[PDB]
Design a protein that fits this description.
The protein is an all-beta fold. The protein has 1 helix and 18 strands. Bound molecules: calcium ion (3 copies), chloride ion (CL) and sodium ion (3 copies). It is classed as cell adhesion.
């Protein structure tokens, strides 16, 4: 007799990877599973696995794969997903690597606040007194932070790439005993930069 011929997948992505942008809206089709059954049997498609089934859903008859929950590359940057196809006599599965594509969706975050430093009034021009650090988990320019004072200061400077704060004019405890500066950390996304502000207190101490 004839033995049933099981279906097999014909998508090219099973051998490489599927890319899905993290800004993909829920409900969006992310691909369509394609399969052949040489008996011309009607086929039913699925996704298997607890995590995969949470994030992705599959139209049983058409094989269209849907986004069921929002993606977030900064929480999980890829998935290994098992898809199935069945002619109702047997079930064939195959795995695909899904890469989550980055969008610039995070502002920088400053660590180890509150920021404060005490320096003596004879601290000379050029002296580094504080290093600010903000991180940005996005990729490329959207993850590359630049620092500035906003508003600017005539007494202190901050290195835009390194976050190193230096004295740029002589200090004088009699004139000013404290400064309140605002550091801006911005990513360098070309279309939609995101930024964050942090306070820096510089306290001047008198020699005696
Ligand atoms: Ca078949
Ligand atoms: Ca991102
Ligand atoms: Ca960013
Ligand atoms: Cl297959
Ligand atoms: Na499932
Ligand atoms: Na994200
Ligand atoms: Na970064």
């Amino acid at each position: 007799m004839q033995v049933n011929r099981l279906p097999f997948f014909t998508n090219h992505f099973f051998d490489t990877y599927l890319l899905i942008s993290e800004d993909t809206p829920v409900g969006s089709s992310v691909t369509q599973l394609l399969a052949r059954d040489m008996d011309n049997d009607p086929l039913v498609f699925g996704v298997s696995g607890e995590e995969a089934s949470r994030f992705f859903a599959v139209e049983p008859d058409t094989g269209v794969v849907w986004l069921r929950q929002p993606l977030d590359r900064e929480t999980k940057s890829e998935f290994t997903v098992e898809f199935s196809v069945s002619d109702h006599q047997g079930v064939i599965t195959r795995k695909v690597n899904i890469q989550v594509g980055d969008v610039n969706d995070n502002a920088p975050t400053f660590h180890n606040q509150p920021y404060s430093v005490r320096i003596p009034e004879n601290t000379p021009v050029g002296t580094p007194i504080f290093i600010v650090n903000a991180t940005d988990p996005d990729l490329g320019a959207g993850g590359s932070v630049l620092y500035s004072f906003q508003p600017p200061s005539p007494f202190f400077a901050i290195d835009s790439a390194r976050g190193i704060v230096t004295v740029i004019q002589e200090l004088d405890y009699e004139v000013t005993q404290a400064y309140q500066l605002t550091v801006n950390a911005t990513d360098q996304d070309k279309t939609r930069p995101l930024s964050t502000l942090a306070n820096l207190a510089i306290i001047i101490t008198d020699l005696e």
